[PDB]
Amino acid sequence: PGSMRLIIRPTYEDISKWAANHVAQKINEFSPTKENPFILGLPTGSSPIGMYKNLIELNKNKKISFQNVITFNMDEYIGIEENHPESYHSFMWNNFFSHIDIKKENINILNGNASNLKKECEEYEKKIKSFGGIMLFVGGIGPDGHIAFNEPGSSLTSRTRIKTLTQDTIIANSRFFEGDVNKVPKNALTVGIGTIMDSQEVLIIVNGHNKARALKHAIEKGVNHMWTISALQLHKNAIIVSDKNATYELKVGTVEYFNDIERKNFNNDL
Amino acid sequence: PGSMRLIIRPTYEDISKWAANHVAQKINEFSPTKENPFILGLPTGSSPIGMYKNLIELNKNKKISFQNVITFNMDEYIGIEENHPESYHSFMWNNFFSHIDIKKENINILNGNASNLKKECEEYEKKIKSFGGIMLFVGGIGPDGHIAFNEPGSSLTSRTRIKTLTQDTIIDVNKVPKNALTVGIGTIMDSQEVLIIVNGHNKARALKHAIEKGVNHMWTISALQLHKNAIIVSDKNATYELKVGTVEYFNDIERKNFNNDL
Amino acid sequence: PGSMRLIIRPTYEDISKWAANHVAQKINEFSPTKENPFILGLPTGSSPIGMYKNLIELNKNKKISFQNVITFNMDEYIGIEENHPESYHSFMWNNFFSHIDIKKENINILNGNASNLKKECEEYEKKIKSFGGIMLFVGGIGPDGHIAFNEPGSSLTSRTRIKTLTQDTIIANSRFFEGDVNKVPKNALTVGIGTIMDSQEVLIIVNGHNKARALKHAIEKGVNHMWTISALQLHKNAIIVSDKNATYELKVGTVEYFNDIERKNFNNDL
Amino acid sequence: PGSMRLIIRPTYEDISKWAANHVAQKINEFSPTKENPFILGLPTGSSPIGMYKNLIELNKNKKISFQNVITFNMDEYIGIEENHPESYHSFMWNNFFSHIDIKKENINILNGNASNLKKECEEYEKKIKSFGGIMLFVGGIGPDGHIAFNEPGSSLTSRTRIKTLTQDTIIANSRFFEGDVNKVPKNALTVGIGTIMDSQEVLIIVNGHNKARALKHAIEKGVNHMWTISALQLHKNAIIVSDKNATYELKVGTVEYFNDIERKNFNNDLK
Amino acid sequence: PGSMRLIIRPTYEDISKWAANHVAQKINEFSPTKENPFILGLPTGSSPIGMYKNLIELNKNKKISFQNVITFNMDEYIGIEENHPESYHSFMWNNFFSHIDIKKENINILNGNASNLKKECEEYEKKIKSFGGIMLFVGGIGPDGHIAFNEPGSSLTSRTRIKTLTQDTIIANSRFFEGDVNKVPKNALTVGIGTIMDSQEVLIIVNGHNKARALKHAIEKGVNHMWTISALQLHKNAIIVSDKNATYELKVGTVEYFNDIERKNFNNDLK
Amino acid sequence: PGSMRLIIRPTYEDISKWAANHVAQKINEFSPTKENPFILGLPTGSSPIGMYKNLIELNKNKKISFQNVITFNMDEYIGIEENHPESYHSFMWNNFFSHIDIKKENINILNGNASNLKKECEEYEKKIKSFGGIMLFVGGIGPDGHIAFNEPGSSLTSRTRIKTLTQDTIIANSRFFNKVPKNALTVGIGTIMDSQEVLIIVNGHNKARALKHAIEKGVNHMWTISALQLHKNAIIVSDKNATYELKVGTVEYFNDIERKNFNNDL
């Protein structure tokens, strides 16, 4: 249309469908091959689950193939067995990779057990750039505007790196490790805001009242390292899909403005 | 001076004369030849009308020549007849290019009738570079802080592209063209120097976001905080939402700049 | 830890010590030689005085050597005699360089008496790059958020350049030219914001109630050319060290957030 | 429902009708007599014209009578001829009082031609109190949050007083004096913010994008003398009716919150 | 010390103890009699439970007596049976009144099953006034700054009245009614903001991160009807007791400022 | 004009002169006699010194007489000798009362050595009312918006009362001196706002942020001066430096009110 895009739909399910379709459409138009595959960045968390389910379905109905899609994931804990049910390796396999025609060797996830964690990070960044860069990175946001383990105060140009988890993250993630703060791994490897920003296109899925304040900071306020999602304002091709509830802190006029862009870009004759 | 400059003058006429003189000063100082021409970016709309009248008047009175000035315009509607009175081509010729010693071939305006619109955008960006960049781009802003078709939410580093008009810009209504070609915020930012003319009470809130508030994609003009050499010239009405201290601060810079012994 | 760090200590003496120890720590671990020297950016003003005093003592107790350290300063006045007691050449020699085992040909300060000032600036930028860039730039901020002569409205990507001084700077600096505003040199040469941002690591020292507002704009408010320190939000490796008094306009939760990062860092097992 | 209400509708026509019906309802439920009349405060300006037209039709169609309604207007200019079309006296007669079954002696308007203007104001306040206060005051707001001639900087507790008009108000109101800025009277008599707040109930009509910023400062921002409308936060029984356009600066959540109050209020199983 | 006070302690347990002690100290110093009773206003919700526990202990230990204490509670649901486990009548008996030496006839709770609900509210305000006003009113606040059922948009000078509950109140209280929003009574009677602020003294208990935004809007931001607690800024004798977690949105300087007020208050050579 | 006024003049000396003439103007227009005296409330601190010097000059030039002016001051320290050079009594005497034809018995200052301090505050309130109220109260503000001892967090409707000083006031007033009096008696914001009219003098860059909160921001107990938004008849007089945090449009708005108030034909 000519600007950052905000797509507002009523429910979590509707945004999940819009997103899955959008990912399918980008890959299908690209038409990957063994020689020129599609490079896809993916999130974990509750946010992308509906999208994952919809993509599995489209794949079953042969509306999309992952044979020539190469994936990079955002992050993984340091010092967790790949087979631990709460590892992000397991999250991805059980929620997505097991159910689609993806090639095991096309899957890239940070190795939180590497001997040299600093090199593992540098190598991930090299691998991404060896493929020409991520074509589409899909992500989600936290209530404080974080993406991945890029927590408030993360540099707006940060790269893949070691991350010690702050108290808020250990608390929030503690529910996956039997309510026990002592059982959440202390550290993680994570792509940076800069890494994500290097993508040719960025899609963010946001839902619920608890992300409303953050969506306000992403959209309407100035670029600010306390709300690292605000970095997206600098990206050339970014899209945020939000449910109605995550818009409660936006101004009426902002919603109308982005609603009209979608209507006008529908009837544009191009 | 080594910082942004905000030039405040009592009226629309004062800022028109000031901006005309600045363009005229920049071009004379550089002394353009057929071999080394001056590369100038230009706006449309009502804001620069005054400037254009003054520039015409200085061209009659032999204070400047446009013989070796290459110009680039920001935009054009897609599908409109080039010679349609409402086209950007027509705006430029009728209000400026018809009254000055400019050469037809040194004029660059986007062709919204190109067979491939994307390539037209690509070539336009390639053309600017083939001259080694705009030297001075002059612009205006909307009350929502937009610069031409780079509207709120435009990427604070976008390039020349097809832009679909928002219903607000559309308002007959079904006669207006649905799409435009436009340079990007990044295209403008590439310029060696950027001058923005702002006038009137309705631009005051935009000016405040441009100057005092943080870099924000809802106010396109705020991308200028990141440019190395930006000047804003504003009349008094457009300053009504600035702090007294901001005004005194930028006024002092002007006096100290005037008296720096350089 | 993988974010901006804010180190808060009770007094100006504590941060002075903290900063000296940090500088010493980075030089000692790099272990510079004649072929591989450490590149150090430095500030003037009263901010770093305590740090300089501590670095001097550490040098006397042989806990650090400046023999293979190359320094670049932020600024100098245009048209002041090098040996004038108020020049920044004199500031640096008298408060610091006179007192450490630094080699004189390793010291770089902008020459405000150079025939072609625009070229002096270009050359200073070229000299920094000839060494491969500044490895640690230490800076201080003004009550209005300025660093060095990058005053409000300095471009957030500014380079080394001629700068005309504003009244507030002339008035403030007039104390050192016997309270006469007219004895203050009118222009200076200064490194830009981008120049400081090019450094691998930036450390900012902040003290006192009259910097509280500026620290707030630096840490909590969006990137903004009126508060040029806010540009550090975009830096990959920035640390701010502050006394308690300069934190008064931050939120309680902000201080606790950055205090927790520090404690986690210490307890991450890395 | 025991809170402020904000009633949002698509257009100026919708809110005008809604406001007319609300007024009709309060009057009909009160059921006034000569001994016990209904006391109604009214504004001028363009905001209430729709409401006035609707109130005339309701009157013609026997759904409301004004026989026992006593009115007090907000303001009148000083030194304008009572019978000149540009006066608030004439505005009220031409747009409203001429077309309804009101009794002439029950109409109250500030006398901008009184010998002692200060005493005129004091008498106005006493006359309001003499009837037991205003039961419903209808007002509008300006783009800067002003009500009547209570311009930004007016005391949040102001009473009826002499008011010297600012250039901004003269420019705006010149639309009512053939665009001639020098035809606008320099001074006005006006009820105060306090006077308005003494009303049992207040109804405010707001429309258009150019009032959006004012509505935000009325609803979402703190009590502030630069936005005199914000004073209603202190009123016991305030209603604002707004078209959609005037809501553009409110948070989505604010609209959703007041919409839900209307929904809950109607479905609350009470009388 | 002549200003609002903000007492910051580490935990909920500390503030509960501080609040209980402060109530006992006020009642003991007044030293009430049958002829001259202490008039005490009280909240429900989880906030005051700590305080209630402490007061019961103090009472058993004869460190405070409720024999000549008249109480008024904030609110009660409409159309709930007094015996219902989740009524406020029961909350108060079960968590407080059953365990102390209070006289049953000295206990005043709004009657949500009254035939004329308006008269009930009116009679509640009259009764408060018949005793010369509330001497100390204790309250808490919600995450949106509400107090009692004085939800956002409630008038800053509101009195006792029927309140239709909004979506977020219904959702938050659904946890006490089988997690089913359709079981939560739709309406309540509630004292107003004006009713609370009529008290000689107001003591507010705040705890937890989820109250941090509201406390900031209470302490630092302008008087604003969307954060009804901010009205305390106009009260002459207001105290807030907060745990450390509820202070996360306040400025470092605000916390230091009120902490210093407490040290200087303690060390002032007056009592 | 029927709104608050903001009078802006270039310098401290200009606003002191403006404030002095405004006080002489209100007094002279009232034309006080012993039977109907003029009731005046007054400030201390550095702010009004200029105004006090100008009113002394006006008094010697026979342009005003204080014979039938009853004054009330805002505060006084608890447990200081009135004769102490740093007491509020001594400040007023030495900076104003000694130099003008005021009657000694027409002068009111809180007695910080009263045996019952609370009764002293109540009695001060009663005395103000006994005269039928203050007709004009002159005040100043601090950088944090405080009005004398009515400091951040004071009730926007506070009355005369005992006030315990903060560390900042004990520190800032240790130059004028641990031997600082820890408490003071002070009139309240509510007390000041009972006046028929209030004039506030604001000077210097360090009060610019306070002036912004007074005028453009909502009523807020952290900025005591904002309470004036509720007063029926408030005037602020300010030099240019203290307007630095106001919007251009606010300055031009109030300047136009000052122009229209001159040219109104009333």
Separation of alpha carbons B50 and D102, rounded Å? 56
Would you state the structure tokens that stand for residue B107, as one six-digit string? 């004029």
Closest residue in E to F151 (Cα) is E3
Q: b or e along D172-197 (b: 16 or more beta carbons within 10 Å of the residue's beta carbon)?
A: bbeebbeeeeeebbbbbbbbbbbbbb
Check: CB of residue A184 under 8 Å from CB of residue A213.
no
Contacts of A15 (CB under 8 A, 6+ apart): A7, A9, A50, A205, A206, A207, A241, A242, A243
Contacts of F179 (CB under 8 A, 6+ apart): none
Of B226, B256, B261, the CB nearest to C155: B226
C61 CB neighbour count, 10 Å cutoff: 8
CB contact under 8 A, A153 and C269: no
Neighbours of chain C (3+ CB pairs under 8 A): A, B, E
CATH number at residue E126: 3.40.50.1360
CB contact under 8 A, F230 and D157: yes
Number of compact structural domains in chain A: 1
Contacts of E75 (CB under 8 A, 6+ apart): E44, E88, E110, E148, E149, E163, E188, E189, E190, E191
Check: CB of residue C249 under 8 Å from CB of residue C214.
no
Q: Do chains A and C touch (3 or more CB pairs under 8 A)?
A: yes
Q: What are phi and psi of C105, to 5 degrees?
A: -80, -10
Element (H, E) at B179: strand B179-182
Would you state the structure tokens that stand for residue D198, as one six-digit string? 């003494």
Separation of alpha carbons E224 and E95, rounded Å? 33
Separation of alpha carbons F9 and D139, rounded Å? 37
3-state secondary structure of A155: coil
C3 CB neighbour count, 10 Å cutoff: 25
CB-based contact, E190 to chain D, within 8 Å: yes
Q: Is the dihedral of CA F115, F118, F124, F126 positive or negative?
A: negative
Would you state the structure tokens that stand for residue C167, as one six-digit string? 């009244």
Q: What are phi and psi of A39, to 5 degrees?
A: -110, 115
Q: What are phi and psi of F137, to 5 degrees?
A: -115, 130
Of D212, D247, D252, the CB nearest to A247: D252
Sequence-ordered strand ranges (E) for chain C: 5-9, 38-42, 69-73, 75-77, 107-108, 136-140, 161-164, 187-190, 202-206, 238-243
Separation of alpha carbons D39 and D73, rounded Å? 11
Sequence-ordered strand ranges (E) for C51-129: 69-73, 75-77, 107-108
Check: CB of residue E38 under 8 Å from CB of residue E68.
yes
Would residue F75 show up in a list of annotated catalytic residues for this protein? yes
CB-based contact, D154 to chain F, within 8 Å: yes
Edge-to-edge, what's the strand order for the sheet holding C38-42? C5-9, C238-243, C202-206, C136-140, C38-42, C69-73, C107-108
Closest residue in E to D2 (Cα) is E163
Q: Which residue has the tokens 């509008």?
A: D140
- Which experimental approach was used here? X-ray
Distance from CA of D201 to the nearest CA of E (A): 12
Residues in chain E: 271
Separation of alpha carbons C97 and A38, rounded Å? 57
3-state secondary structure of A247: helix
CB contact under 8 A, A153 and C264: no
Separation of alpha carbons B163 and B149, rounded Å? 7
Would you state the structure tokens that stand for residue D3, as one six-digit string? 């809170």
What DSSP line would sit under C236-267, residue for residue?
SSEEEEEEGGGGTTSBHHHHHHHHHHHHHHHT
CB-based contact, F178 to chain E, within 8 Å: no
Would residue E75 show up in a list of annotated catalytic residues for this protein? yes
The DSSP bridge pattern shows strands C238-243 and C5-9 to be parallel
Distance from CA of B234 to the nearest CA of F (A): 13
Check: CB of residue B74 under 8 Å from CB of residue B41.
yes
Query: Which residue type does A88 have?
Result: Y
Q: List, comma-separated, the residues after which chain D is broken, a break being a C to N distance over 2.5 A; otherwise answer none.
A: none
D99 CB neighbour count, 10 Å cutoff: 16
CB-based contact, D221 to chain A, within 8 Å: no
Separation of alpha carbons A138 and A130, rounded Å? 20
With contacts defined as CB-CB under 8 Å, which chain B residues touch A2?
149-151, 154, 158, 161-164, 182
Contacts of E214 (CB under 8 A, 6+ apart): E141, E142, E143, E144, E145, E206, E227, E229
Check: CB of residue C101 under 8 Å from CB of residue C65.
yes
The DSSP bridge pattern shows strands A238-243 and B5-9 to be unpaired
What DSSP line would sit under chain D, residue for residue?
--S-EEEEESSHHHHHHHHHHHHHHHHHHH---SSS-EEEEE--SSTTHHHHHHHHHHHHTTS---TTEEEEESEEETT--TTSTTSHHHHHHHHTGGGS---GGGEE---TT-SSHHHHHHHHHHHHHHTTS-SEEEEE--TTS-BTTB-TT--TT--SEEEEPPHHHHHHHGGGTTT-TTTS-SEEEE--HHHHHTSS-EEEEE-SGGGHHHHHHHHTSPP-TTSGGGGGGG-SSEEEEEESGGGTTSBHHHHHHHHHHHHHHHTSS--
Check: CB of residue C268 under 8 Å from CB of residue A185.
no
Residue from F75, F182, F217, F221 whose CB has the most chain E CBs within 10 Å, to mutate = F221
Which structural domain, as residue segments, surrounds residue E206? 1-271
Separation of alpha carbons E201 and A245, rounded Å? 40
Closest residue in C to A231 (Cα) is C234
Would you state the structure tokens that stand for residue F219, as one six-digit string? 């009523």
Distance from CA of B155 to the nearest CA of F (A): 30
CA B106, B110, B115 angle in degrees (round to 5)?
A: 120
CB-based contact, B242 to chain F, within 8 Å: yes
Element (H, E) at F236: strand F234-239
Check: CB of residue F155 under 8 Å from CB of residue E233.
yes
CB contact under 8 A, D268 and E186: yes
A25 CB neighbour count, 10 Å cutoff: 11
The candidate with the shortest Cα–Cα distance to E123, out of E110, E138, E106, is E110
Residue F130: burial class (beta carbons within 10 Å; 0-12, 13-18, 19+):
exposed
Separation of alpha carbons F113 and F128, rounded Å? 20
B116 CB neighbour count, 10 Å cutoff: 9
CB-based contact, A250 to chain D, within 8 Å: yes
Edge-to-edge, what's the strand order for the sheet holding A161-164? A75-77, A187-190, A161-164
Distance from CA of F190 to the nearest CA of B (A): 31
